[PDB]
Amino acid sequence: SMEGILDFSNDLDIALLDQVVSTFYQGSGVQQKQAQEILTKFQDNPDAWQKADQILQFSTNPQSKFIALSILDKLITRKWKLLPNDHRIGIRNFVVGMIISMCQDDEVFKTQKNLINKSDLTLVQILKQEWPQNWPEFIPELIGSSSSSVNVCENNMIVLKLLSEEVFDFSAEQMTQAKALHLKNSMSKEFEQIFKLCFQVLEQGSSSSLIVATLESLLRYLHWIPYRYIYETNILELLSTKFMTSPDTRAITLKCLTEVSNLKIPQDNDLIKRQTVLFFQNTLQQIATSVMPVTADLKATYANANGNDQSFLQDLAMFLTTYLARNRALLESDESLRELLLNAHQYLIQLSKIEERELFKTTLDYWHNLVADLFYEPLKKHIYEEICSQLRLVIIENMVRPETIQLYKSEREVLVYLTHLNVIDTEEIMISKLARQIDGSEWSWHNINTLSWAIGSISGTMSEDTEKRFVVTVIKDLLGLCEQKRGKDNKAVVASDIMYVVGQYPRFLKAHWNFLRTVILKLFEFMHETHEGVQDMACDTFIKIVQKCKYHFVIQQPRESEPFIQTIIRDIQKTTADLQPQQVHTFYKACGIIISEERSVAERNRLLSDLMQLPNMAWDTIVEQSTANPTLLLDSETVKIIANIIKTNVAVCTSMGADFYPQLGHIYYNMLQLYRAVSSMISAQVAAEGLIATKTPKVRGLRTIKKEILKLVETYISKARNLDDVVKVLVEPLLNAVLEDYMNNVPDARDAEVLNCMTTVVEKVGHMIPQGVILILQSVFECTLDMINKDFTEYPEHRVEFYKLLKVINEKSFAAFLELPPAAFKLFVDAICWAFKHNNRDVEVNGLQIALDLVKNIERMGNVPFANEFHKNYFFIFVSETFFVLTDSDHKSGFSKQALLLMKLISLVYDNKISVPLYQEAEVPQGTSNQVYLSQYLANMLSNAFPHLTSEQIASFLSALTKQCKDLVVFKGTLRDFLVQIKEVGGDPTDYLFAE
């Protein structure tokens, strides 16, 4: 029944409209849904705009008049210039009239602000089309009609605000470069008249609604107007006094003054300097007397959230930080300005205590600006001693967990600066906070952690003798604090914090060996503590200390008979007996860091052998009984044992890289045999159970083995220094073990890690194995492409790794693509373009890079038959496929790299780098230049793809584009101009001369 408005042969029944609209806005459930589909189909009728005047006149429903204006908006912005000039004048007239009649009925003006704002914006769309060339009197007549009515003057302020926004704030994406400049110039020409009106209203007006809308528009003007309108009038005085007193105007005025603090200002006129000081002085004065004194508890006020207090305190933070970052030097040398300077910073101290993460980040960035300046600028830091002293306490008390990573690093930076500025104050604050943990007055899990992080963050700022006294005092107090408590939970927290601080002071650990030893031995004791988190803490602290202090584990210390690494390896089974496998691997990885500090080859390899003794024996056993009867590999326990052995090798190899080679050779050949046996079992299970077998624990366990073997090989090869051995010992067994298995498994059983592993092989040694790269392509290219070329969705990992592999092959061993049969080289081209069309950034970016790199490979071949055949076969495929993703609105994330590729393609022809004609002997006169043919191909291509463009538009665009194919920034502007023009009818072809 509701579907009747969709019949346009009959008149539009307004009453049926208002019922559909109401059922959508106030209705619910199925009725609401139905009305929605109707309203969308109605609004999307390309004729609905004709019935807009009916609705605006004879509807009583503001939602329906709003939809009417949306239908008009679509028409003005997309099809305006196609209309008979009659309709254009008509539409304009009954939008102007509808607005006047709404402003005159004080009742409608009061209650229909949403419909009035929509009408204003619709008017502003017309201005973007018609003004000032076809409407030169708009501004004068607007200024004239303002004095005849407060409601009309107020609404004119809203029209100008939206106009300023559309011209200066939001034009970059929505208009051509030429059209934007024209409107900016036009507004600039008549601004003197607009400012006059705006300043009179402000100085005389008493209607707060009129005032607020004038200040709202002023906020927009300050983005672009010249400073003289601000500094050569009284308006700073008004903003910083009169309008800071009223809470109505206060929020908008403050945002205006924030922008004023950013105006382009000559930094050498003394009077302007005094004006910048003065309006800051006034503003702080109004806040102290009308809002709150500098002593007020802003933390409590923000938490109470009365009225707009939270927004106001945010805006004050933004004002103070913006102004002071730019102008605080103005206040630092005059003694009469010292109180103002420090009161402004004291407000910031109070703002910095508010519990509000994002606001804290805003003030924290300012503090960084300040303490960095006090660290370098002569004679400044004494000014701020008392501000900085308070800041130390604020930052220490609001320290966040390290490893919210970004906020901790910012807090650490500010606190390190503040420690350099006064070490003594920092040390005293931290010890004092520590006593109130011991004396229980501020003791809490949160509070003791916060303080340990703060103590840990300043490592490196004290002298080593002060640090030594400081660290000692901190640990001593902490130890006593742990004893003081009972119950695992409490004692767990303090003991962790103790280890955190220790881990942060490696300079101290390096100089106190006996202490370092005791630390480590305690971490070991904690690797048997089953309390939740202790063991993870012990292991993370152990490796963290090792990364920093490794040299002290590898030399023989005085009073020790052996390097301590040997003592760790001897007891490693005991030490790790109660750890979970992840934690064991971290432990072995930490040991590998130490072992790589030993530069004597024989001793390094012996340490390596001893460290791997347990996994190597479990390995030998398993290889012995695994080969006996391949039944075991069905034993989930043996599969878990195998994967954990491999993971241990990955961990140690991650630490040792090139040094890991001897251990790799101990397992390499049997590990690849194991890869094959596991492969057969996976295949055998998928045959006996179907594809669902890949989801079962047993098969997932077997695939884990294969994946960790590939990760191990990848990890070693990406770090190897001896590439002769990589090529002549590692690569051939590896390719024989993995390539055929991948090609001949069903898609759901192929591991994408095989692709990632091959990408690394090509990366590091691709140049040395051209036959191996060919073998790789043969085995993975076509069968992987067929997995991923049916949709953009399936096999997401294979997709990504596929194009990482093609990318590296195209860089390092481009010969492999030359050897492809012509049929398969054509699939390679198809595959590149396929990548263009992904929204998945991982895929899309590599697809554009491969295309770019391929063109360069082809270019470097010179005038030879393969290059000539490539341009004949694929040049225009690349030009048109690139143009497609450039213009279809669904690949905006790749604009830049689409542009680059397009610019390279076009430049080849305008530099005569293509030796054969790109056309058929037939289709063009003999002797035609590729330049001429390219311009014809593109004109025809765009004419059929964008039939609503004129021949002249297309020709001016292509002339500009080809002319600018050496200037990427300009080329890109011309492309963006084109993307605007295809969205509408009637685009000015002269826009494309903007660069010229």
Partner: peptide, 10 residues
């Protein structure tokens, strides 16, 4: 800080 050796969680 040889009192570290007696650090216990209990």
């Amino acid at each position: 800080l040889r009192a570290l050796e007696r650090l216990q969680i209990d």
